[PDB]
Write a protein that binds this ligand. Sequence first.
Ligand SMILES: CCCOP(=O)(O)OC[C@H]1O[C@@H](n2cnc3c(N)ncnc32)[C@H](O)[C@@H]1O
Length: 610
Amino acid sequence: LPVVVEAHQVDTFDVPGVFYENHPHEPHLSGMNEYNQLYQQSINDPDTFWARMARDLITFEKDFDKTHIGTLEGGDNAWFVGGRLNASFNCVDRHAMRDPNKVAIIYEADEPGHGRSITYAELLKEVSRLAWVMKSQGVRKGDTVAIYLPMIPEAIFALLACARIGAIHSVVFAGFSSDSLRDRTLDARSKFIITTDEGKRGGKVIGTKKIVDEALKQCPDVTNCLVFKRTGADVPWTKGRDLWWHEEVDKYPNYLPAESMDSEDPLFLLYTSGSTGKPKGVMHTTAGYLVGAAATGKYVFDIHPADRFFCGGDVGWITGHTYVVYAPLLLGCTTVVFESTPAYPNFSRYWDVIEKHKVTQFYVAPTALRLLKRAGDHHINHEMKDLRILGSVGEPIAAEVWKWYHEVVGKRQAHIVDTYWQTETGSHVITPLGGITPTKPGSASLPFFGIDPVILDPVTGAEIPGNDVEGILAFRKPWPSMARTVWGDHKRYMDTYLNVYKGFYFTGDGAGRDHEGYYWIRGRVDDVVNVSGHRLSTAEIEAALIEHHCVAEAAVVGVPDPLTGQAVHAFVALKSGNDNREQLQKELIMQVRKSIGPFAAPKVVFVIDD
Ligand SMILES: CCCOP(=O)(O)OC[C@H]1O[C@@H](n2cnc3c(N)ncnc32)[C@H](O)[C@@H]1O
């Protein structure tokens, strides 16, 4: 009967009472009244609200002159202008100064019972001497550095060492093919790459150095490749280009100065798939991105310095950027770097890790939850006494999965926080606040501070006022962690995000706002599909399928899937005939695996006449 049909007869759920009784500290907010007061200030007077938030959470070398200049339509937004700071100083130095022996990183290795814990002082040493390696090899402020690493603590060392010297890290998910790594390394114009000899995940060997070698044959500007010895396997070696991480860092001091950066110096590039064209290098700058990361870590995930935060996302994606690395380290707590899968050695692994390390917040994709729920509740039998926040990201956590997460995983003692955001927003933008916001199963709830959502008519672009409305999700105002450009193509950034509905930021998602103002995310309205947590471009996959000599035309679509959220399905029209039609279906799948990576392979390729 309502316009937003998903909300029909869905009541809110309060934060469990025991959450407050068992809390080691207390929430950073007194309740929803204070959220509403701070939220209104963040919209009505963002100059005052964000200046105080930034000065609360981020240590500047030089205080900023003005909170924000520019406009959405101008595509000229700048935050904390005139400030100077360094991201590695805020993630590492200031904490090592105060509490050097506090654990910063818990490394959980692919095999249980391995791994190690890393203090803030140890982190400062490893970041410093890795930064010395890059500096000695000629990396300078403003250079991009390609990173092709699995989930080991050396990945955090690498991001933060780039930030320490003002280089711009460009992390490439270690499941990408050599073609995909090559394309991102070329576009970023990186001259330095960091990788492993091999990766280990779920007991399986990933031949990272071999993949890198293949990519670098076509990246002539890459003059050094720093290799971390993860497995010790014999790998191909290029004298004069390749260097061993362990050999190089032993040469250099255990401390390096931090480079003084402008608030608006680029911090990183993250190549992201869009509705049209090759992946775009989404650029985040420094102060605004860090402010958003710290602000959401604090108020969304209820992070306090003593906490042990565990995000299951990969450093290759924005979730790992913001919530494995930047947010928890900015706030000075402990973060978990998890090398394995939730199924290795068995389906208990996530809970084994949470129980061993006394994790307080866990951040998961619903695809992983559905896999585990299907495996059966006998794999979950873990006290997990400290687990009080259960975050979810990537798609709506639907009622059946929500209930399982709340009751079986959380024992009705944790607050489930469904966080809506995207690579381009830097940090959470519509989400409940942990320990504060009442929630609805399947809803992202309410906007974060500084986020002013509107629902637009898809055709006319007109704003649809009031509640129980549906349409396009857009934001009316800039926010600190917004992506600042697409690398090398500001015009595409303008045309993609800011020129579609002038005066607004276009998310590419549909949404409903229900009778109580709660937001229900409908998903992408463009040709972007989200498959097992992977943001994929159907146009990219079609182009991959066309690379096959038999295929003339290709069409790929995303369809609902009970486990992967959505499944990509591909249709091809052949140029002639193929008596090995079942055999062609294998070559087409391998073609996508070569062009993009295993994770992008279509479930099936249908060969049709027209
Ligand atoms: C933030 C990690 C993933 O970042 P990406 O840039 O890869 O993907 C962003 C997209 O994921 C979906 N999405 C993300 N979170 C949610 C969410 N909580 N509910 C519904 N859809 C969601 C929305 O369609 C969005 O445009």
